[PDB]
PDB file of C-alpha atoms in Angstrom:
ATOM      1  CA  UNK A   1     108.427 150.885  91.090  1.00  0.00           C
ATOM      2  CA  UNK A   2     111.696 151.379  92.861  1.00  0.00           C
ATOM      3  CA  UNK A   3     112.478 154.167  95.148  1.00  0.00           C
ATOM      4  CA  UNK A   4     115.181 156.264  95.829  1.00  0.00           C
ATOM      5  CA  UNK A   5     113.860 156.602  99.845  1.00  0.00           C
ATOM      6  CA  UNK A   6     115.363 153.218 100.859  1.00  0.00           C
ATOM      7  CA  UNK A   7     117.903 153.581 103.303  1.00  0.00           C
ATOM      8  CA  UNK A   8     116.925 157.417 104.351  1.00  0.00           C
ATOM      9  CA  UNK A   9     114.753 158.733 106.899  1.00  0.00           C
ATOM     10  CA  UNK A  10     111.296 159.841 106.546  1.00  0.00           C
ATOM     11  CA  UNK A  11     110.684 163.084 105.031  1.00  0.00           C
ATOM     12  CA  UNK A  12     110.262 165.779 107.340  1.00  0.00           C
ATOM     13  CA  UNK A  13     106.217 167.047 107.074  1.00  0.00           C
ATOM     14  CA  UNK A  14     103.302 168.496 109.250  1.00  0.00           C
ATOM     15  CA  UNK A  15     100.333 167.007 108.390  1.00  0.00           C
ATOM     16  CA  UNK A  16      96.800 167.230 110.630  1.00  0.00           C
ATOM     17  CA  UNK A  17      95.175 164.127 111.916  1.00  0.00           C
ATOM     18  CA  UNK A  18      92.385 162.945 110.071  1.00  0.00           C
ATOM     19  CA  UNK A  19      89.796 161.696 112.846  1.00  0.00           C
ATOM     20  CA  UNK A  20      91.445 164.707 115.236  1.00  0.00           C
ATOM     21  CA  UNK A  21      90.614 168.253 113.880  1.00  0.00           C
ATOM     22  CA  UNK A  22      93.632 170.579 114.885  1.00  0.00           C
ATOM     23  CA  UNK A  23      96.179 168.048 116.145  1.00  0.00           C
ATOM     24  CA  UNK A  24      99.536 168.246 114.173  1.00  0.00           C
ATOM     25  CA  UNK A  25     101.793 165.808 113.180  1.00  0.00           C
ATOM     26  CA  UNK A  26     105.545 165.447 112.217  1.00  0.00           C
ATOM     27  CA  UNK A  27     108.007 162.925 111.119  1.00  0.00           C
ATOM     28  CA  UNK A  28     108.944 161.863 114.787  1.00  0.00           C
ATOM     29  CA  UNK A  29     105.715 160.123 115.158  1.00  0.00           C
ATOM     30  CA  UNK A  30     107.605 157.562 112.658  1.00  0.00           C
ATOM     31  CA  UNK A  31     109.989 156.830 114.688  1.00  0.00           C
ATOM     32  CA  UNK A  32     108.084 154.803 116.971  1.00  0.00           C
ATOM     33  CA  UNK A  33     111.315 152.841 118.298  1.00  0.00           C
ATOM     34  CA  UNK A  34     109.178 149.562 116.269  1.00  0.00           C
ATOM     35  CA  UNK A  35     108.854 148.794 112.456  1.00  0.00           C
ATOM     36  CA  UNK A  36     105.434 150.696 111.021  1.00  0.00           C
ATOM     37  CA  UNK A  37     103.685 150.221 107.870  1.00  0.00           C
ATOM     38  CA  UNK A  38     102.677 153.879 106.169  1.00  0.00           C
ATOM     39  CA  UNK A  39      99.578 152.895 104.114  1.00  0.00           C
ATOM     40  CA  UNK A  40      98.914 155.460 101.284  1.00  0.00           C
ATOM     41  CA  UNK A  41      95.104 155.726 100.244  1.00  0.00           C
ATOM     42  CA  UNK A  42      91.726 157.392  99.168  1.00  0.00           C
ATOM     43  CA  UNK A  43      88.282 156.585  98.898  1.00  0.00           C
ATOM     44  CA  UNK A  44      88.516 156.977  95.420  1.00  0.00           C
ATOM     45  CA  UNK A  45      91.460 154.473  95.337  1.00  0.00           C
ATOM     46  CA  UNK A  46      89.693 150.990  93.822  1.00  0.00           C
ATOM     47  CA  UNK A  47      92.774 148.787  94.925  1.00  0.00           C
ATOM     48  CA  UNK A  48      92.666 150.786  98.028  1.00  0.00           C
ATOM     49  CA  UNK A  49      88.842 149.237  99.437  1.00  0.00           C
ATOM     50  CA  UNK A  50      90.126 145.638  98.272  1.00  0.00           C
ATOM     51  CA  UNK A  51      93.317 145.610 100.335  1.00  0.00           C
ATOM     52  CA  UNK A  52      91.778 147.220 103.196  1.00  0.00           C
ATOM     53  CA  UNK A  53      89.912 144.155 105.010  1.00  0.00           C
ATOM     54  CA  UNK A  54      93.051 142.526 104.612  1.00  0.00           C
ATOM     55  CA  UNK A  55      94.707 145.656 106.638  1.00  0.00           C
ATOM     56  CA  UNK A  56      92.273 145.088 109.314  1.00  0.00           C
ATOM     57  CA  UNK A  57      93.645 141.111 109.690  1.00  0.00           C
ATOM     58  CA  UNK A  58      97.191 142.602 109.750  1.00  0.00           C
ATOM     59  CA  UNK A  59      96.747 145.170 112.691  1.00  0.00           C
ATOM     60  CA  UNK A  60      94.507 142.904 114.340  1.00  0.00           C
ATOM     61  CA  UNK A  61      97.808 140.925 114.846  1.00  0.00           C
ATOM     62  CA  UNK A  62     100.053 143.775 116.048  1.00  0.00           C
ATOM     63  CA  UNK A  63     100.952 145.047 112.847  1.00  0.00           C
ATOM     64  CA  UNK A  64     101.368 148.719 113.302  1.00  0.00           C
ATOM     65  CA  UNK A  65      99.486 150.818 110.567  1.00  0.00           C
ATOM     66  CA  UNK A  66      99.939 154.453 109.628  1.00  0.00           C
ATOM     67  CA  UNK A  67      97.204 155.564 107.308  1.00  0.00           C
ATOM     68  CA  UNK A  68      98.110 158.971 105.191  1.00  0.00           C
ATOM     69  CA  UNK A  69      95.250 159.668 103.739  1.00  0.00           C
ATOM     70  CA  UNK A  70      96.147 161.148 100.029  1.00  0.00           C
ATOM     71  CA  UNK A  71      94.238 164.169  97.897  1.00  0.00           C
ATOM     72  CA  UNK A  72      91.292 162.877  99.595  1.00  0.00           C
ATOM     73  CA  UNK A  73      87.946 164.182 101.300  1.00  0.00           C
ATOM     74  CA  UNK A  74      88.098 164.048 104.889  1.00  0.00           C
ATOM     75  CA  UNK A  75      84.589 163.449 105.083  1.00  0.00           C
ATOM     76  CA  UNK A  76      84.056 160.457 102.853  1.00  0.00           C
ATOM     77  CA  UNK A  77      87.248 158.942 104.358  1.00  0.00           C
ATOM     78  CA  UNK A  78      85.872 159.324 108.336  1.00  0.00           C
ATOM     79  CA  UNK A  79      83.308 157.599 106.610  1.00  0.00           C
ATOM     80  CA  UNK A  80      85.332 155.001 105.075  1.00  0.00           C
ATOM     81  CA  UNK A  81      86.841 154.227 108.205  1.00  0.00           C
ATOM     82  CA  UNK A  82      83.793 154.094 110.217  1.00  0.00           C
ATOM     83  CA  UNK A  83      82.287 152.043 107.565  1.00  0.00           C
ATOM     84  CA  UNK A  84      85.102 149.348 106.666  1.00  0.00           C
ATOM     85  CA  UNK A  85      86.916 149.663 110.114  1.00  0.00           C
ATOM     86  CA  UNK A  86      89.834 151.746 111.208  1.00  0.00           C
ATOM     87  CA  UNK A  87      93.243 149.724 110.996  1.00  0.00           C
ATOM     88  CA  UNK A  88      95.598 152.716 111.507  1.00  0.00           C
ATOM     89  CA  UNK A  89      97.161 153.164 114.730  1.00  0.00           C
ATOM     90  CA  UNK A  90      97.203 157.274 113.536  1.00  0.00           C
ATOM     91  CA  UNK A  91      95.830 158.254 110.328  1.00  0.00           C
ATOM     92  CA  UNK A  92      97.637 161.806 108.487  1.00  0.00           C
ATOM     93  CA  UNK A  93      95.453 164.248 105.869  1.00  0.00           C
ATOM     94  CA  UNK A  94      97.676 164.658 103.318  1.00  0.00           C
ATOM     95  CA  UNK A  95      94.744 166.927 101.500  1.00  0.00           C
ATOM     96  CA  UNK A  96      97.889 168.562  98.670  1.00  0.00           C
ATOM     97  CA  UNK A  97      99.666 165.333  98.805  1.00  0.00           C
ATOM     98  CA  UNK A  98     102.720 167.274  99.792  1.00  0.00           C
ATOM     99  CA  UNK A  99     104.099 164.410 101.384  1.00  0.00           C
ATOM    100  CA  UNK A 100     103.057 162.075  98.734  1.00  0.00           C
ATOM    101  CA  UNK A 101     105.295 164.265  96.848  1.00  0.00           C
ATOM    102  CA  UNK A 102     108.570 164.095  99.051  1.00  0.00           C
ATOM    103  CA  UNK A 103     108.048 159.974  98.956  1.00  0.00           C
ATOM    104  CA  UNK A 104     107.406 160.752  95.597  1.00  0.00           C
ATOM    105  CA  UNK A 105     104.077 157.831  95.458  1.00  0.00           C
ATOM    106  CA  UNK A 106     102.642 156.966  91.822  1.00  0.00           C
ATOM    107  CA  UNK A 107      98.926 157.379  93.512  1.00  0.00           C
ATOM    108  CA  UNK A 108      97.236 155.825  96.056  1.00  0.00           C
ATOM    109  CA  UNK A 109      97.539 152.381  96.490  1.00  0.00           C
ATOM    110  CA  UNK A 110     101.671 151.952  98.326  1.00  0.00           C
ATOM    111  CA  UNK A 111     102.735 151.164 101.248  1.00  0.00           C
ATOM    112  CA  UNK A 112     106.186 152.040 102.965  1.00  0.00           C
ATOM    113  CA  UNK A 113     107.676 149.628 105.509  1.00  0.00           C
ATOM    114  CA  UNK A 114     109.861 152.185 108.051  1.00  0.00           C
ATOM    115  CA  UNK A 115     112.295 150.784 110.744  1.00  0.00           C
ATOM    116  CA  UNK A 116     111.972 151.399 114.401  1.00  0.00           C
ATOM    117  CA  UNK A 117     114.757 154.796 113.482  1.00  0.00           C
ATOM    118  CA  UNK A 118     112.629 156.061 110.937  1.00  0.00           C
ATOM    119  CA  UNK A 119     114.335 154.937 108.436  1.00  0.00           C
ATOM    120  CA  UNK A 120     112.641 154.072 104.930  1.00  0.00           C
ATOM    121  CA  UNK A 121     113.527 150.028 104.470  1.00  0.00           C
ATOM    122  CA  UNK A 122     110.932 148.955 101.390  1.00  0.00           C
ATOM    123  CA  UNK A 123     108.161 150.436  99.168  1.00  0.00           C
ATOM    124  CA  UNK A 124     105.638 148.187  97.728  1.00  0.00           C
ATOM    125  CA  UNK A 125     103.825 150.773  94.714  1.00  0.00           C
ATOM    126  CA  UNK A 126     100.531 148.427  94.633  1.00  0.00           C
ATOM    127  CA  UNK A 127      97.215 146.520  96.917  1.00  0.00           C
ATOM    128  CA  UNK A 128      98.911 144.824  99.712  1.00  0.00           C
ATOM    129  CA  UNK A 129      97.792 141.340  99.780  1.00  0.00           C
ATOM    130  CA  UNK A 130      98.794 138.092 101.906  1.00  0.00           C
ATOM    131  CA  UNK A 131     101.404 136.918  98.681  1.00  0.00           C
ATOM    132  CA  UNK A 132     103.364 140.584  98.687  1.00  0.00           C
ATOM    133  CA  UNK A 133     103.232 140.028 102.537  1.00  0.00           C
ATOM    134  CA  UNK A 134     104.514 136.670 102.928  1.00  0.00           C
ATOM    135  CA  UNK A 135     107.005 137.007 100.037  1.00  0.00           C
ATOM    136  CA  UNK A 136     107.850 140.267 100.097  1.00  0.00           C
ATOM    137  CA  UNK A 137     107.818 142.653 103.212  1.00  0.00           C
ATOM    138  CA  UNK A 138     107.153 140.057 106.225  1.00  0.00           C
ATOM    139  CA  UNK A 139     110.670 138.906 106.127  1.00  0.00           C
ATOM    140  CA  UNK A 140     111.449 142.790 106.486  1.00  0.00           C
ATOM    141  CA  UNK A 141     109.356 143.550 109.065  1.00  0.00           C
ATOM    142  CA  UNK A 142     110.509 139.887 111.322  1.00  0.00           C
ATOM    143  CA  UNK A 143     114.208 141.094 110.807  1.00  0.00           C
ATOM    144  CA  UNK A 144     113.773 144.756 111.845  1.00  0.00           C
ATOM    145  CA  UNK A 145     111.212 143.639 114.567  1.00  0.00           C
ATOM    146  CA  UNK A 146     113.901 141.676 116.386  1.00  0.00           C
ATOM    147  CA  UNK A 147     116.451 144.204 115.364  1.00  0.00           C
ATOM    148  CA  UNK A 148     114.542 146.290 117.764  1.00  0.00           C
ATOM    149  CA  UNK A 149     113.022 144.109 120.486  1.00  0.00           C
TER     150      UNK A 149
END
């Protein structure tokens, strides 16, 4: 449904890196000067397994993927990457889905497009498939991909 994040920056958050025990995180890794795709999911996410070959396709192209893994088990989702392939670029625990909370997600299952600033430009609550891509946030991502190169 519709959000009340587009057009403000990330929320601020520490989160620990999934594949990288004791490494911290914070919103400036956002802010990666590029457009970046923050992919909420969990193994126990059905939509989530279905969209996620299609994830690979997209990075594989240069599409820059953030994974924030949500209320999930670290193990079985090293072990979902390892299994289906690891899209993400950096991938976030967020075990109390405390940041799920400030973006205020449904569930698993949505994806954020952010601007090269960090700033929050779409929210697609859903699987991410080649029709929401093509119709919905690719013509996002081309304009704030050249509004940055």
């Amino acid at each position: 449904l519709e959000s009340a994040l587009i057009g403000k920056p990330v929320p601020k958050f520490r989160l620990e890196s999934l594949d990288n025990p004791g490494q911290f995180y914070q919103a400036d890794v956002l802010t990666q000067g590029k457009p970046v795709l923050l992919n909420v999911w969990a193994t126990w996410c059905p939509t989530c397994r279905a969209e996620h070959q299609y994830l690979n396709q997209l990075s594989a192209q240069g599409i820059r993927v953030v994974g924030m893994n949500y209320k999930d088990d670290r193990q079985k989702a090293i072990s979902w990457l390892k299994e289906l392939g690891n899209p993400y670029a950096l991938s976030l625990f967020d075990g109390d889905g405390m940041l799920g909370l400030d973006l205020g997600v449904y569930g698993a299952a949505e994806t954020f497009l952010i601007d090269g600033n960090g700033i929050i430009r779409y929210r697609h609550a859903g699987d991410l498939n080649p029709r929401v891509w093509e119709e919905e946030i690719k013509p996002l991502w081309e304009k704030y991909s050249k509004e940055a190169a």
